[PDB]
Amino acid sequence: QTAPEVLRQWQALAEEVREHQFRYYVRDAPIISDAEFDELLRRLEALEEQHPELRTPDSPTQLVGGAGFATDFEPVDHLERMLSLDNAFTADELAAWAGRIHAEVGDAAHYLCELRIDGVALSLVYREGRLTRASTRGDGRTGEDVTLNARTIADVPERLTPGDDYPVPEVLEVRGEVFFRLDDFQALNASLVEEGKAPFANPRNSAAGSLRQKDPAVTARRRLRMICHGLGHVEGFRPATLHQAYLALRAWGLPVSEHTTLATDLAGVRERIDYWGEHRHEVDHEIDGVVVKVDEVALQRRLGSTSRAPRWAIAYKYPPE
Numbered sequence: 001q002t003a004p005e006v007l008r009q010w011q012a013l014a015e016e017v018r019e020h021q022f023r024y025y026v027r028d029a030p031i032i033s034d035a036e037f038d039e040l041l042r043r044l045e046a047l048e049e050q051h052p053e054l055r056t057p058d059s060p061t062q063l064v065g066g067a068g069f070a071t072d073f074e075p076v077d078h079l080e081r082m083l084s085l086d087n088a089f090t091a092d093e094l095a096a097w098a099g100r101i102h103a104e105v106g107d108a109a110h111y112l113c114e115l116r117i118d119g120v121a122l123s124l125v126y127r128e129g130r131l132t133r134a135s136t137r138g139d140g141r142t143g144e145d146v147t148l149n150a151r152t153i154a155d156v157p158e159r160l161t162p163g164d165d166y167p168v169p170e171v172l173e174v175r176g177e178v179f180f181r182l183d184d185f186q187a188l189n190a191s192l193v194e195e196g197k198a199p200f201a202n203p204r205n206s207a208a209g210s211l212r213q214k215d216p217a218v219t220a221r222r223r224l225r226m227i228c229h230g231l232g233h234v235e236g237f238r239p240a241t242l243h244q245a246y247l248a249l250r251a252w253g254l255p256v257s258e259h260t261t262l263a264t265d266l267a268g269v270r271e272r273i274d275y276w277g278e279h280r281h282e283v284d285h286e287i288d289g290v291v292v293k294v295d296e297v298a299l300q301r302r303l304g305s306t307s308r309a310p311r312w313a314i315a316y317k318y319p320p321e
């Protein structure tokens with residue numbers, strides 16, 4: 001019946017209530033019944049009556065009953081630099097990129113291979129198994145805040161899944177690409193034209209437009225998808241290598257692509273690149289390349305991290321036509 005418990009009760013309740021507000025007005029997918037949700041609000045209202053100090057303009061009860069859900073794209077910092085990637089359009093370049101690697105830091109290096117989904121970058125900051133910030137790439141130190149928009153992608157869990165093999169990290173910042181599916185892209189386009197709205201020229205643009213909405217509910221109606229493909233700052237998770245990292249991601253419920261393979265040498269990499277050149281079309285989303293990452297985390301550190309690029313990864317891009 002004192003300030004310590006009073007503050008605690010309210011904050012816990014506010015967050016619980018605000019989230020149910022957001023899951024009902026935004027999303028159109030509430031996890032609790034309206035019967036229940038109404039009880040929670042009552043409690044918060046009760047405590048608010050008991051203590052008027054808590055009544056504020058930013059409280060769900062005092063000034064915002066179903067409002068206060070907008071995205072202003074406020075600049076926000078990235079915990080770790082989110083760099084872009086060097087590209088390779090010819091085999092010589094790939095070989096050349098992979099000369100430095102095994103000119104220096106020799107052999108222990110395995111090369112993880114992944115598909116290159118040409119979508120929109122997204123950086124999610126997970127704090128204590130909770131999603132607190134979602135941001136765009138921007139310049140690679142600072143991005144735009146799309147917390148609310150990003151909270152609606154079906155593929156992004158709001159909370160990490162606790163697991164024994166992989167304990168939930170304290171601060172997990174994971175990068176990814178938000179994209180459509182080809183079929184869904186067309187459907188959305190036809191929806192827009194029914195509304196007398198201009199359709200999008202390609203899925204990336206659609207990807208992007210759908211994500212950057214001032215009103216997050218708009219973003220909820222559209223079937224945006226997300227893969228996780230990298231990690232930034234992390235506390236309480238020192239994954240030995242990047243392939244093992246994906247194991248943890250899956251354990252926590254984060255989306256991971258199933259076309260990633262591990263290649264011991266350049267020959268294995270080459271095989272994948274030749275393979276994906278002929279089977280790129282078969283995938284449900286746009287794939288314009290193959291990203292080859294020197295996988296061992298330790299080796300990544302030993303290798304450079306140049307201005308606006310990493311030295312331990314090369315993106316082989318296929319010719320458009």
Ligand SMILES: Nc1ncnc2c1ncn2[C@@H]1O[C@H](COP(=O)(O)O)[C@@H](O)[C@H]1O
Pocket residue numbers: 083084085086114115116117118120121122137177229230291315
């Ligand atoms: N393994 C990956 N698969 C698909 N896309 C990736 C992967 N890694 C990085 N990306 C994205 O590709 C971009 C690098 O190409 P770019 O931004 O054009 O310089 C990154 O900034 C990410 O948005």
